[PDB]
Amino acid sequence: VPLASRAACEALKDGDMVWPNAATVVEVAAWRDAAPATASAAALPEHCEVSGAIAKRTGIDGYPYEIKFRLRMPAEWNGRFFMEGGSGTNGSLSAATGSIGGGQIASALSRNFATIATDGGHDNAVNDNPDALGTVAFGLDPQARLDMGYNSYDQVTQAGKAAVARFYGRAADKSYFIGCSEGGREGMMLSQRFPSHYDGIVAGAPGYQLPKAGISGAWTTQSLAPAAVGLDAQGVPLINKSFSDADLHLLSQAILGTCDALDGLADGIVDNYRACQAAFDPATAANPANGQALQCVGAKTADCLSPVQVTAIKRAMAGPVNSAGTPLYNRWAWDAGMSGLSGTTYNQGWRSWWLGSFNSSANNAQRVSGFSARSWLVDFATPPEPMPMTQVAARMMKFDFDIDPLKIWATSGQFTQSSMDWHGATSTDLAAFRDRGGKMILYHGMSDAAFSALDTADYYERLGAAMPGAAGFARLFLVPGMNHCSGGPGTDRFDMLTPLVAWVERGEAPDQISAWSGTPGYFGVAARTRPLCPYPQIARYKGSGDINTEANFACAAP
Ligand SMILES: O=C(O)c1ccc(C(=O)NCCO)cc1
Ligand SMILES: [Ca+2]
């Protein structure tokens, strides 16, 4: 009977707890001792851990499906509920201590939140079909698609909040959600489709048009193929051979040559991203090291990009169009984090998406033959298109930009919703969310090759147009030099949760968000802190003091 006790915890297992979904099966209800801090994680307080599943069933593919959850409820509780977002194609159940992203030591459980996580409705250990491209195989089941898109996060939010009410005898005062990439998509989905589920939302590098990522992948694959060298085991050009690491570093150094000082300070960071896009063209830019053109006049040298390379990358970066010339996704910003050198190690965080590792005999780019290309085929194309894994790269090379893009909007047979219907989160109708007090912090690294930061910026402009005064409840924080969710030559680490709570609960909007670099070696310094600035502002050096110190910077126009 006593609230927030071992006894209250074990009583959750099964029968006096009423779950919102009748098909909820608790498998674990265990009391956990406080855990000390480690070098990489903050101390976790004493808490109840509950795990189990919702809606166990058999899919039309004959496979088992269920929505797994793990919930942790501290004995000493700050009254707040927290859910972390997913990543990739989901399918795994995390420790559910409430990750807050941004490379942070603290978890939400370490801050005395009750924390929940889900696997999204499928299980990479079970829903792994060798004939349906592996752990993307859940896409063969219509309901599993719906669970991946929106239904799992809905079910698990409701289950968590009911358990919180039972365990503590009181409903959560506020609820918070934090996710990056696929978890960023989840957060935008929540603000649009379930506006009262969460009071504060952080959505980092959000895949809010994830079904179009494969379209961009086909495009970047085909755009880069002319500059490839060699073929793989099934005759596909080695896209990874199109640019060596030194070649990409050359390109980022040219970008810096053109763009670094456009914010007023030569420091290896392009804060003025808009001015950079208007000024930089690989075909007209100079290599700063030797005042010559970046594009070769003669044969290929180490200080030089070949004409086909420059053409390939310009076309990749422009984004896909169909035969009518219609943009299918968006363009991508030139930025210094496409490469970067720290010590003797070249940044791999940009090139792994479209190119893959140079020192390989096979293709391995996420968008050529990796999980992104596989996920489009099975998860987002309706009629799913399962095939052997060795055919995926060829399928991207043969992708038809008039025919195939239609498949993310199509229904067929028992696939009664399109992948844009269930996975997309493109709505700018956030009024219900704003008007109950909701706040949303978006962020995106500029050298993200999974999702275009410019496309997030375009969503935010549309939001601002649809909802005048939107900066009162939603702000976007672009991070120069940052790659996908983390890494790269930028200030990629930050505590988003503290400003989010301040906004929701005190009405204190973030006019800036402190950040620091996880690899300050990209700049040859020991540390670098900078403000992140709300769109469309950028960080501006005040003219004196340490260039690596955030206090000497302010947020302003470019
Ligand atoms: O299908 C894709 O293209 C794609 C899907 C999910 C992610 C993601 O969530 N990344 C997590 C890394 O933090 C990235 C790309
Ligand atoms: Ca600069």
Numbering used by the authors: 43 to 56, 59 to 602
From the paper:
The main chain conformation in the MHETase-MHETA complex structure is nearly identical to that of MHETase without substrate (RMSD 0.54 Å) and sheds light on the positioning of MHET for catalysis. While the catalytic triad and oxyanion hole residues are part of the α/β-hydrolase domain, substrate specificity is almost exclusively conferred by the lid domain. Hydrophobic contacts between the phenyl ring of MHETA and the α/β-hydrolase domain are restricted to primarily F495, and to a lesser extent G132 and A494. Strikingly, MHETA is tightly bound by the lid domain residues F415, L254 and W397 surrounding nearly the entire MHETA phenyl moiety. The two oxygens of the free carboxylate make contacts to R411, which is held in place by S416, S419 and the backbone amide of G258, which maintain a hydrogen bond network involving three water molecules. Despite their overall high similarity, a detailed comparison of MHETase structures in the absence and presence of the substrate reveals an induced-fit mechanism upon MHETA binding. In the ligand-free structure, F415 points away from the active site and thus opens it for substrate binding. The association of MHETA then triggers a near 180° rotation of the F415 side chain around χ1, closing the active site and consolidating the interaction. Our structural analysis suggests that R411 enforces a strictly required negative charge in the 4-position to the hydrolyzed ester bond, which clearly explains why diesters and diamides show no binding to MHETase. Thus, substrate recognition strongly relies on the aromatic ring as well as the carboxylate function of MHET both guiding its positioning for hydrolysis.
